Amino acid sequence: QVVASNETLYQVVKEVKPGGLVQIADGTYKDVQLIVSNSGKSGLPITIKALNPGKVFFTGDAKVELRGEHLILEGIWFKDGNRAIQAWKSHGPGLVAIYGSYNRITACVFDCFDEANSAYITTSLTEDGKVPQHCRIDHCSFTDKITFDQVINLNNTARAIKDGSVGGPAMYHRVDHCFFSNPQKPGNAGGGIRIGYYRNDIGRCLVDSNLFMRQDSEAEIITSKSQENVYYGNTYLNCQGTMNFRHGDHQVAINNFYIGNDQRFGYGGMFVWGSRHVIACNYFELSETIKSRGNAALYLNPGAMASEHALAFDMLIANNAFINVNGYAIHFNPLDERRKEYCAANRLKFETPHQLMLKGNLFFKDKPYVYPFFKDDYFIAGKNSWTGNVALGVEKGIPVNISANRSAYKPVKIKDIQPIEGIALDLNALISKGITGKPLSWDEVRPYWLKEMPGTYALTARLSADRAAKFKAVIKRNKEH
Ligand SMILES: *[C@H]1O[C@H](CO)[C@@H](O[C@@H]2O[C@@H](C)[C@H](O)[C@@H](O)[C@H]2O)[C@H](O)[C@@H]1O[C@H]1O[C@H](C(=O)O)[C@@H](O[C@@H]2OC[C@@H](O[C@@H]3O[C@@H](C)[C@@H](O[C@@H]4O[C@H](CO)[C@@H](O)[C@H](O)[C@H]4O)[C@@H](O[C@H]4O[C@H](CO)[C@H](O)[C@H](O)[C@H]4O)[C@@H]3OC)[C@H](O)[C@H]2O)[C@H](O)[C@H]1O
Ligand SMILES: CC(=O)N[C@@H]1[C@@H](O[C@@H]2OC(C(=O)O)=C[C@H](O)[C@H]2O)[C@@H](OS(=O)(=O)O)[C@@H](CO)O[C@@H]1O
Ligand SMILES: CC(=O)N[C@@H]1[C@@H](O[C@@H]2OC(C(=O)O)=C[C@H](O)[C@H]2O)[C@@H](OS(=O)(=O)O)[C@@H](CO)O[C@H]1O
Ligand SMILES: CC(=O)N[C@@H]1[C@@H](O[C@@H]2OC(C(=O)O)=C[C@H](O)[C@H]2O)[C@@H](OS(=O)(=O)O)[C@@H](CO)O[C@H]1O
Ligand SMILES: CC(=O)N[C@@H]1[C@@H](O[C@@H]2OC(C(=O)O)=C[C@H](O)[C@H]2O)[C@@H](OS(=O)(=O)O)[C@@H](CO)O[C@H]1O
Ligand SMILES: [Ca+2]
């Protein structure tokens, strides 16, 4: 039914049946506490949507909880929030918290919501430990986030100091066609998306066709902290951060675009911990790279095998292109001094990346940047395997013989790569095709009803005066008195 107030919305959601449709009349729903406990059924979802998307605002001291299964939340604009700062935390539920499985949030806008620390959307465990699975977040816009924590956390365990061999279960979520552009916070402030917590967690989430444009929240654009997540066809445009395989082996990134096209800041880029990954058909063209990480497109972590800073080794790096990177194409030992400190403290064995299979990559420069393609301060003959690469335009920086024949450059065919269970992509086929398509634009990901890009930061790299003032107040209250 059509509802036009908070109270009527609360009532209709208590009664709605599988296949039901709740439409919210034009207006502002201030301090709205939408808790949806009922469930739809497979093929009979319950849809809660604006009657006219773009005309419904959830504001004030608001929250949404999707606790039932088979629910769809659509066409809501979250702005002008005022949740209690003492009542919300990073690593807690999001503004929208999804506790049930088979739920979808689509074509919603989150724009500088408030000053309370939390994600904008989470999947969250219930108190009895049940893990939501098979959820989708798509065609949503996340802009000008001025609070701590990620924009989205996808959770399969409760936060703990941890380290017990039993990880969280596979989630099988999808995040697609979303737009992220958010200002830099201080420190380890929470990024774009976190998936899982530690290396025994299984993710099996698909993150595809998103546009991260000045996603600058903190060092990590995405902190992927579970196994077997697949990142396909995302665009990272002028982002002050890197997309990271932070914990969890056997993750996949194929045909993403990492573009930096001005000199305003250092941009990234991928930072990779762990082993057994597939990193293929990605395109890196970065006009400036990140000083603090080591100035590179692709960073391969040194350290102790399978530790808290897991050594990057034994993986496939295939058919990628590094075009006019103002930095190393590949840095084989970033942050090595900090990592030796970690390994010494914990009495762990420090190692450097090896057993890498570098196949069919193009390394090309014709602009006067000063960096050789590679940095490997621990180079050992034979430790990695290079086949079918092409390198031309600057010295390699390591003693490896690579063809310089660009005309003869072709991506390699690959046929031995196992797909990820639950994700309907043919990894061999996609890798063997080489790099397809081009960077995504706002029109390709935007909510169907929204023509104008929201936010103040994406086009300008600066918050508007009023939002800047709120951001300063958040940062101040979160640091030492
Ligand atoms: C993410 O998305 C981006 C693009 O937004 C992709 O970008 C590309 O790749 C990047 C690497 C590059 O950077 C970029 O430049 C791009 O080149 C990126 O790869 C990622 O892709 C994934 O997301 C896509 C997306 O969501 O946009 C997926 O594309 C969708 O795939 C499904 C398509 O639907 C099918 O085709 C349409 C036209 C429907 O079929 C037609 O149905 C008509 C009416 O029934 C009929 O007359 C026609 O004969 C049919 O052809 C659809 O059918 C389904 O729906 C209809 C109603 O419309 C009926 O109910 C049917 O029963 C039902 O089957 C087809 O579904 C199979 C959709 O068009 C397409 O957008 C992509 O596959 C993902 O990998
Ligand atoms: C709630 C939702 O859309 N979940 C996504 C899931 O889609 C469900 O499962 C399938 C399926 O064929 O396995 C189809 C329907 O779209 C839906 O029931 C699926 O999303 S996808 O279909 O857009 O690809 C996965 C990705 O595999 O992500 C969510 O789990
Ligand atoms: C709110 C927030 O997450 N801020 C990050 C800092 O964490 C807070 O401050 C401290 C502290 O001892 O100084 C401890 C608590 O975690 C928070 O109250 C801190 O993050 S972290 O180091 O704890 O992971 C700094 C580190 O640079 O990052 C801020 O973003
Ligand atoms: C100890 C702790 O929980 N600190 C939180 C951070 O987590 C550490 O940092 C990261 C990371 O990739 O940033 C990985 C380590 O394994 C963690 O011990 C971090 O939280 S999270 O969202 O990345 O899990 C920050 C983010 O705001 O929050 C700290 O409190
Ligand atoms: C406790 C810990 O190792 N946390 C990792 C982060 O490391 C801290 O972050 C930084 C920084 O500027 O990024 C400075 C502090 O001295 C570090 O202790 C960080 O890891 S990394 O930067 O060493 O690679 C994040 C990933 O960005 O992961 C945390 O686990
Ligand atoms: Ca972080």
Curated annotation (Swiss-Prot):
InterPro entries: Pectin_lyas_fold (IPR012334), Pectin_lyase_fold/virulence (IPR011050), PL-6 (IPR039513)
Organism of derivation: Pedobacter heparinus (strain ATCC 13125 / DSM 2366 / CIP 104194 / JCM 7457 / NBRC 12017 / NCIMB 9290 / NRRL B-14731 / HIM 762-3)
Claim: Phosphoprotein is one of the keywords in the record: no
Role description: Cleaves the glycosaminoglycan, dermatan sulfate.
Pfam families reported for this sequence: Chondroitinas_B
Protein name: Chondroitinase-B
Keyword terms, alphabetized: Glycoprotein, Lyase, Pyrrolidone carboxylic acid, Signal
EC number: 4.2.2.19
Lineage: Bacteria, Pseudomonadati, Bacteroidota, Sphingobacteriia, Sphingobacteriales
Effect annotated for changing K225A: Complete loss of activity
Domain of life: Bacteria
Annotated phenotype, changing R339A: Partial loss of activity and altered product profile
Glycosylated residue positions: S209
Assembly, per entry: Monomer.
MF annotations from Gene Ontology: chondroitin B lyase activity
Catalytic activity of the protein: Eliminative cleavage of dermatan sulfate containing (1->4)-beta-D-hexosaminyl and (1->3)-beta-D-glucurosonyl or (1->3)-alpha-L-iduronosyl linkages to disaccharides containing 4-deoxy-beta-D-gluc-4-enuronosyl groups to yield a 4,5-unsaturated dermatan-sulfate disaccharide (DeltaUA-GalNAc-4S)
Active site: K225, H247, E308
UniProt record similarity statement: Belongs to the polysaccharide lyase 8 family.
Keyword Manganese recorded: no
